[PDB]
Design a protein around this ligand. Sequence first.
Ligand code: 3PE
Lengths: 112, 69, 80, 71, 318, 96, 111, 344, 96, 172
Amino acid sequence: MNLMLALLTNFTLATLLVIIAFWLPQLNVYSEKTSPYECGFDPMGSARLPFSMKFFLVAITFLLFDLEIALLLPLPWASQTANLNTMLTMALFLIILLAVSLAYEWTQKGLE
Amino acid sequence: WFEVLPGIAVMGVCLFIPGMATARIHRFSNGGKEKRVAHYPYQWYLMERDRRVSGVNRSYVSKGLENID
Amino acid sequence: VAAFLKNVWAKEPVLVASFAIAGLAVILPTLSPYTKYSLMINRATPYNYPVPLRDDGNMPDVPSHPQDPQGPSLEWLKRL
Amino acid sequence: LLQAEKDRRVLQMLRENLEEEATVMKDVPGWKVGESVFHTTRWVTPMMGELYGLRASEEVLSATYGFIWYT
Amino acid sequence: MFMINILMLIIPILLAVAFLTLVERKVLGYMQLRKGPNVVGPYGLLQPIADAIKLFIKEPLRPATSSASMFILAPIMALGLALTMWIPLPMPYPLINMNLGVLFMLAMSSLAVYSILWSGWASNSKYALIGALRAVAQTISYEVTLAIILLSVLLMSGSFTLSTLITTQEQMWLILPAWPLAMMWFISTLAETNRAPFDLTEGESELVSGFNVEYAAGPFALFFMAEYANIIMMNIFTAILFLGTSHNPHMPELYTINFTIKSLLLTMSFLWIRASYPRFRYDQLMHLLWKNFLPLTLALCMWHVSLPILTSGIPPQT
Amino acid sequence: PFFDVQKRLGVDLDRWMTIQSAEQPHKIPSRCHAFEKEWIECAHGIGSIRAEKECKIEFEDFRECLLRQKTMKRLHAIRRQREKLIKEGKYTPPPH
Amino acid sequence: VELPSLEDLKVQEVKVSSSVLKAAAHHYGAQCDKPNKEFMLCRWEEKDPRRCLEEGKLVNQCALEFFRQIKRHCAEPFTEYWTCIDYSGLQLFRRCRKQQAQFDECVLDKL
Amino acid sequence: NPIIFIIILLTIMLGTIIVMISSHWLLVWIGFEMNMLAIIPIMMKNHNPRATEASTKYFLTQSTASMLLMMAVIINLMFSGQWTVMKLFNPMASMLMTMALAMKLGMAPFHFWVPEVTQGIPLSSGLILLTWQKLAPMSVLYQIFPSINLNLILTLSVLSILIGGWGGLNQTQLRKIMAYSSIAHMGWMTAVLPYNPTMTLLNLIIYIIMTSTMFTMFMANSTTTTLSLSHTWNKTPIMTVLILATLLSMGGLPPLSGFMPKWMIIQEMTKNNSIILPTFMAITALLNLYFYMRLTYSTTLTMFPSTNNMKMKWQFPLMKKMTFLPTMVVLSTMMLPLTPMLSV
Amino acid sequence: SMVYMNIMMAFTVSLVGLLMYRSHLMSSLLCLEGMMLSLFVMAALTILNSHFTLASMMPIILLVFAACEAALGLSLLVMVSNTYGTDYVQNLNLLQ
Amino acid sequence: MMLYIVFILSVIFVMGFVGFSSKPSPIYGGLGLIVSGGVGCGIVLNFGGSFLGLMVFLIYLGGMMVVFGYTTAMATEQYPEIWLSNKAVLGAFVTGLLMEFFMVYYVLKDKEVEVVFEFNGLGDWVIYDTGDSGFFSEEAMGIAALYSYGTWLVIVTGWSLLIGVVVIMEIT
Ligand SMILES: CCCCCCCCCCCCCCCCCC(=O)OC[C@H](COP(=O)(O)OCCN)OC(=O)CCCCCCCCCCCCCCCCC
């Protein structure tokens, strides 16, 4: 029953330590002028964040290579079986189904 | 070249506590015997049995041969 | 064609080390006779509990006492 | 050997969870002593609620959740 | 007293991550030909008590332009998943015994980068805005290099738990047999945790200062104490997953003694690099992963799969 | 239209995962396993249109093995034979 | 339903820990096999472990005299043997390998 | 590019062959889950600001359509815990099957969709492929066939063949006019379905042909009704006797084959002594005809040939198998009392 | 028992006004990609509390598409707001 | 740490949703999930299924969501106000929250009320286990690795993914 005793112990030191740092001098009596001088060294910066694509694909591109290496995960439990040939013949398919899915897209990464 | 030899001896020892703490709490809490481990539901099944027969309530006290005479 | 195989190894000697290992792991499992030992060991590990069958007449083998002569030889592994 | 210890532990366990039930009340709009919730008749391994009653204190919590979350 | 075995862990480690910052510039000092913090100590060993106290006295501004609700829950993390990950880690006796726990790291290795995306976005514009976006992008592409080459060896040891992984490395220092992989286990944790040769996340050269830029002395001790709570853990891991010690059911103590005289050598590697090599210019940085690091890591997986099967080797586990 | 090719030629596409009792690789059972081989035995040579009005017995308990729907009610109704009378005598049990 | 009374219960269970119970445990079953395999067949062959209680007292019985046997001849090498294996975690069998002969010195020999 | 377009366009039917071949509820999920995965790029090809505001109004309307099903698969995994494919053992399953499956076919409601997609897919080429998705689902309904609440599958039917009828009388674009009156013929085949479920397929094949041979004809350039006026005095008049030899046969008149489904279907729906149902269907497909008349008064009335328009060139499209179909879309009535005993 | 009525009230997450609407499409698409876990967990119990031992992979296959496919339909939501910059379900243009 | 530590998770889970099932300015949408996903992977880690729980962290909650969050900087919403922004979100909330509460109130606030909510008893986890058992990897989803019997189940999923990229290499 002692796991949650070992988790909420950990946060409660951390969720404590924000206030004793952030908050404690935050109410101190120093000046702290409201002037809009903050947001350093790009003073104003008025724009939307524009769509920039080769930022985007490197999200998608991963998400799919991700899945099957969940599918690929239960090899070391499956190395203990009865008929094993249906493993080696089958196990090696996923991989090559992964590696193929590279080679195609590999004609165009662009600047990744 | 030497002046760094003290700099280690802080970090080093401070990692030699957490390895000797848990090691000597388990050996201390169960009185000389390393903590049991239940990975598989069969393995558990003997402790929760052994709790019943031990002396009162615990899994760390073994009866022995003279128990049943 | 061997001039090709030496003129991709002056430029990209990387994936070539993957293909070189890509095959050579597919080929070999159909060769070395160490395999098929691998399938015998892995079949004989008694995960379950053996249940004794009923003996009326035959009873081909396998007497009541297990250590008596009963059945196959699994001790070719113990010496192995 | 190990099993021949358990089967006795549940049959002991049902009786006390019956003999100490049938002596709670015998009610006219009550139930017959040890009926069957099924029609069919053979031994079907009982549900946790059968062995431990509404008892529901601790030694239960160390039974159902005993194995999970830790040695 | 199980609660006093925990709090005996969280506390005694915050001294290492503190006194690393000192051995930071002594070791990196004599690479330069000079001595390290000296005047204050006398030996310097007294420096970090003075540094922990300058920050929390020093006033913690917030940007007028920020969303305060995110500017807390994010750092209130950079110190959890750093201090939770330590839990099931055998030395020799881990505080928890998790059946399949090895997988549990990747659970907590994957969930920290979702505390970068908050903070850099939580605040404001383009030095921490698109500057905390594109350190997301490199941090997730160095997992696929990882989980595979973690999954390789685990064919060579049988299960997901860590009590077996001391048994199999007995008299064989698991670095012989896969030494090709082991390299890539190193360049990963150095690329993923944002350290020297691929440095970009925290800025010096490519930008001003990455992701730290806004936090004043107040919160910025946490990150500067969080970022060093990952680095001494992955490197206190690698040496349970490669360079194994020899358990001793009798003098447990001599296990850890010889264990910190390894994991503490190993670490002094991310410092022994940082004096040396320059940076990658974010194109070359990912552009060298798909093309180059990856094709092998698949290829070897087709290899450590068959090698047990093709030798009747298959390791004794479920 | 359901062609059923896997009947004609030899392959098994699925047919294994299908029901609650087939193999279970190490031969480990389900809880209500023993009532399958009972209930399938009933309707096989049947054409299933009379099954509904024929068997129905071996099916119902099987639906009541699965959900434990009733035994949980006759159980919850011991909490009304005791634990309204706790004060009125027969604490029941004696501990132990 | 019919359940047997409270009787033919409270019998003599072998009461020992789980460390000693795996100490011999090995010479144990290979040499006995008088009720036990047979007692399986009073379960697997016909289920409902209620109709079959009888050999349960035979198979439980075989153990009684077994541990009652061993106490007479040599308990000294045994007592020291199941101490090491009881020095713990996982209860490995590959640590006590040395002492395995001392327990088995005359057991396979004398009796 | 050109290879894969035959890899994609092959995987579709492989998406619907695992549907008809399977024993196992999981596979009939995966089975038409990978159409909504493998259909989408076909819509795209010319990358325009409709197809992409089309296939996204399609997508999330076949996304839930599926994703409810998986909720009505896992209900009877509770009760009876036996997958396979047979009556659904529990009423919250079926009522959550059939009226959430009507989304892919769309029936009487669940069509604000079929006109929003079929219109303004920039790709009119086909769009003949939206005759597959009529053919995946039915190959469930034929199996589950003896479980329906029976007060529904008619109540989506009879509110359909009506609502798809009136939908078009107001329409001009002739991709819509086929979009409408393709809800209609989903009124006849699932109104039958509990009574003798073959003599449905009969209406299913006669439908796949007739709507098929329309499009292949609508492919030369043809788009808007008033571009079918500039047709006979320009392209070829032997085209016009065709478009009048079908559009009439498709609502149907007894010397043609379009009359073949009704003529047989009512043999079935009476003999079960429901004679007050079929008239109202029989009589409502009537004002389903007044699209086609008034479509057919466009092309034979020589309406203002376009302008000076001189097409002296010959044709090079693919008419493939158009030189057959309106000898089988018309003349087959004289042939067959086979269709009830042939596919059966 | 009770854990089957939660989570079920959760699987009315559909709620459809909040399935297509209102704008910020990303909120709609969101409650979709989390319509799973109402399909998953619910089917990670019934499989589990009774030992099927075989369908146990099915939970894995309920994600492997639920991520694969729902990650597709994200793509379009770039094409919409690439040409715009605001998703805003309020784009109707193709009409009927 | 009572017997109700399961019932206390789900009713946080059920409340995990209604945060993002209304209309929260979807940079807080995530924070309606990773709680729900978290507690969700929480519930599953009881019952004995473990491996299958600890994956949702790896494959979905950890891996997937980040893409859901790596965008919504590309679709990036305007800095109008967000969250409490427009006065409308709050109205839709409570009536959901109470609707299980008022359900949960007299669902059982008494002996029984009435029938349809009365056939679910509570508190011992009556079903939640059975008897004892042996061990295989555990017993249950401990053996989730079938490259034996399952094949035609993989090779579709194995092949259906390979096309996932081709579709997306185009429209991109
Ligand atoms: C910001 C301030 C506010 C936040 C404060 C609270 C924050 C909490 C954040 C939670 C983050 C950690 C949660 C990760 C869960 C991991 C659980 C796990 O993996 O445990 C492993 C273990 C597996 O069991 P096994 O070893 O196979 O069998 C043992 C047999 N004796 O499993 C077990 O032993 C059984 C599991 C027992 C634990 C009960 C379930 C705990 C998990 C609940 C998490 C709830 C989600 C909270 C929000 C998460 C957001 C990230």
